[PDB]
Write a protein that binds this ligand. Structure first.
Ligand SMILES: [Mg+2]
Lengths: 164, 164, 164
């Protein structure tokens, strides 16, 4: 009953990531599923090698959730008479890459300190906001540690975007 | 003041939960307020039997936040033996029922490990994403533990959806 | 290219907060960046006096993320009586002020208990939902403690809204 359904849209879901070697200050981009299950891309919105390609200039709502999981470090142990230690952390950043502009722009960042006292831990980081994007722009999701990303379920780790 | 405004929309808010009988091993569904305070259903969106009934096929953005609260368990107090205990957890899942399976499809899931050290705790889990739905499809929010859900305020626990 | 690109929209980003003498019986409102970097206001959306002024009645999706951070307190140090301490907490509330009703209406609230063991901690609280708003209504983001708000990056703390 409408014609605004021709707007670029995409919902991508996590897939097994390929273990890569990187420096602490490096944030690997995630690989996504774009056609199977709940994943999809329509109306010219295309997915290609970690990037979501913007086909039309306009304001887009961009979102992503990344569930992290891992064994509890020793952040919580037996310190001194009141001298704890720095906590670990996890981070998700949604980045925008423009061909005319080399240096990527960080649009969203979700960062959390981690220092649990249990056997193991897990938690999601959700991010969502509206940005003005240009045709040709490319979006990618970077995380602090690929090995901590839960890639098991399409409903726990995803990334999507739509033209408003 | 817009032509494209007759779109199905709804924002549901939490209420004290009426106990429902425990029949099977599954996440119990939350039931909501849909017409009082900040809650509403309009343009054919139908809130029925704990489900948000989709009146028109298309792409919808659905979202929910559930705030959990409780007394701290004994997870923190690990048996003196250099061995931490398995952490507790809280989960929120948004499910789709299409009657075309009719096995429910989990659209979004937010799950966090919980091993607090204070006397008590509380935290929210927020989820939101876009999905292609058909008329007749049904959406519900399920949780890991009804007794841990904060039902005190309409602004702390809610669920909503709108046609893009 | 479109026809609905004339809808009120805005994405606000954090800035160093100016010390204020707020009333102890209320959460201080944050002030934002509205035109530099990733921030913007358009199609009549008006950011004035810490408020996002609604220029057109309709249904709006509003969101915000506030990243909090601080040096851990004594909560982690359970009482010498083998009893846990009441936790500290961080809260974000998105409030609506109307010309009609005298008191403000809380639309969204994200509240989290804080009782870390590490030396320091940091975490984001993200909120997003849809509300029916009338021209003239004003939206603001209030927080429990301004000194715990990370004002460092435009991608960590933000606030936005767009007409549906
Ligand atoms: Mg009722």
């Amino acid at each position: 009953l409408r014609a605004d359904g021709d707007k670029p849209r995409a919902h991508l879901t996590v897939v097994r990531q390929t273990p890569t070697q990187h420096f602490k200050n490096q944030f690997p981009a995630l690989h996504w599923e774009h056609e199977l299950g709940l994943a999809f891309t329509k109306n010219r919105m295309n997915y290609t090698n970690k990037f979501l390609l913007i086909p039309e200039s306009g304001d887009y709502f961009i979102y992503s959730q990344v569930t992290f999981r891992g064994m509890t470090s020793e952040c919580s142990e037996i310190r001194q008479a009141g001298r704890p230690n720095k906590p670990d952390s996890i981070t998700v950043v949604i980045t925008k890459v423009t061909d005319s502009y080399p240096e990527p722009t960080q649009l969203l960042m979700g960062t959390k300190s981690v220092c649990e006292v249990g056997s193991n831990w897990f938690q999601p980081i959700y991010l969502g906001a509206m940005f003005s994007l240009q045709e040709g722009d490319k979006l990618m999701v970077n995380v602090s540690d690929i090995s901590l990303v839960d890639y098991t379920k399409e409903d726990k780790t995803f990334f999507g975007a739509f033209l408003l």
